[PDB]
Design a binder for this molecule. Structure first.
Ligand code: NA
Ligand code: NA
Ligand code: NA
Ligand SMILES: [Tb+3]
Lengths: 169, 168
C-alpha cells in the first residue's frame, strides 16, 4: 500500500487532482503546499494527510505578457541560485509562481526587494506570500489539526528550517 | 510529525538525516526522483521514502556556476512554456534541474535542448529519464526489499499517479 501526495501550487488544480484520486479509489491521499490556504482547502475537501512545504518565499508575478513574466522569473532565479536557494517555477495562466527555499531571512528580504524592482522594470504585478518561519508553521499546523488534519508531515531542502521547527515542536 | 528531507544530492541528504537524528527527530523520511539517493537513504536506515515520480532529472557539469545558471535559464524558458513544473538547484560542482507535469513529447524536446545546450555551451549533461509509472513500480519493489517500510509517491501530474494506481 502507498500514500499519494498531490503537490499543488494552485487551489483549483489541487481540488481537481484529489477529486480524480478519490474517483480512482486511492485509500491514502495527501496534499503538499507552501500555501496554507491550499492546505486548508484540502482539509475542508476531506484530505486527512497534509505536507507543509515550509520556509522561504512564494513570489507570484501576474500579467498578460508571458515573455515579461519569464524574463522577471529568470532574473529572480539567477539571484536566488547565487545565494544557494532551491527554486521551483510553474507558469499557470497569467501567473508565474516562484517557490524559493534554503536562504537566510536576510537574503529573503533582498529577494523580496528584487521582486518589487523586477515587477516595475517589466511592468507586471508581483505578490510575495512568503514567511515560512518555524514559529508561523507551528501556529498554522495547530490550525490545520483543528480543521481536521490527522497526519501532518513537514518538508524542506533546508535542514536548518526542519531543525528550528523540530526545536519548536 | 514526520520530517521529510528533500534531496537531489546524496551527500547533503546523509548529512541532513544525521543532523535530524542527533537533534532527536523520531520520524524521518527522504524525498527524491533519484532512485540512487533513495537507495542511499534506506542503506543509512531510513524506513520512509517519498518517490518524486516521473519527468526528467538533468545534471549540468564542467563549467563555472555563472555559466550553469545561464544554461538553467535557457532550459527553464523552454520547460515553462510547455507547462512544466521546474525545480533548479545549484549544487557545488553541478546544476540539477527537475522537470515534471508534461507528456513524453515535451520531455524529448527538453532532453534534446539539454543535449544541444551542453554542446552549444561546451559542458557535460546527464539526462536521467525513466520516469514512467511502470518502472516506478519496479523501483518501489526494489526499495521495499532494500528495507523501505513506508513508500509515499508524489507528483504535480495527477495523470502519472492515476496510471501508477491502475498498474499497482
Ligand atoms: Na478554512
Ligand atoms: Na521540540
Ligand atoms: Na510527475
Ligand atoms: Tb515533496
Amino acid at each position: 500500500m502507498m500514500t499519494f501526495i498531490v503537490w499543488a501550487l494552485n487551489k483549483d488544480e489541487m481540488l481537481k487532482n484529489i477529486e480524480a484520486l478519490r474517483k480512482a479509489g486511492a485509500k491514502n491521499i495527501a496534499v503538499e503546499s507552501g500555501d496554507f490556504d491550499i492546505l486548508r482547502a484540502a482539509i475542508e475537501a476531506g484530505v486527512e494527510t497534509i505536507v507543509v512545504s515550509g520556509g522561504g518565499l512564494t513570489i507570484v508575478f501576474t500579467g498578460a505578457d508571458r515573455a515579461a513574466l519569464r524574463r522577471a522569473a529568470k532574473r529572480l532565479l539567477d539571484a536566488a541560485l547565487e545565494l544557494g536557494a532551491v527554486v521551483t517555477v510553474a507558469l499557470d495562466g497569467d501567473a508565474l509562481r516562484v517557490r524559493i527555499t534554503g536562504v537566510p531571512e536576510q537574503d529573503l528580504e533582498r529577494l523580496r526587494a528584487l521582486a518589487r524592482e523586477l515587477a516595475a522594470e517589466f511592468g507586471i504585478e508581483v505578490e510575495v506570500r512568503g514567511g515560512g518561519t518555524p514559529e508561523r508553521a507551528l501556529r498554522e499546523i495547530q490550525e490545520l489539526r483543528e480543521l481536521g488534519a490527522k497526519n501532518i508531515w513537514v518538508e524542506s531542502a533546508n535542514v536548518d528550517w526542519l531543525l528550528k521547527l523540530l526545536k519548536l515542536s
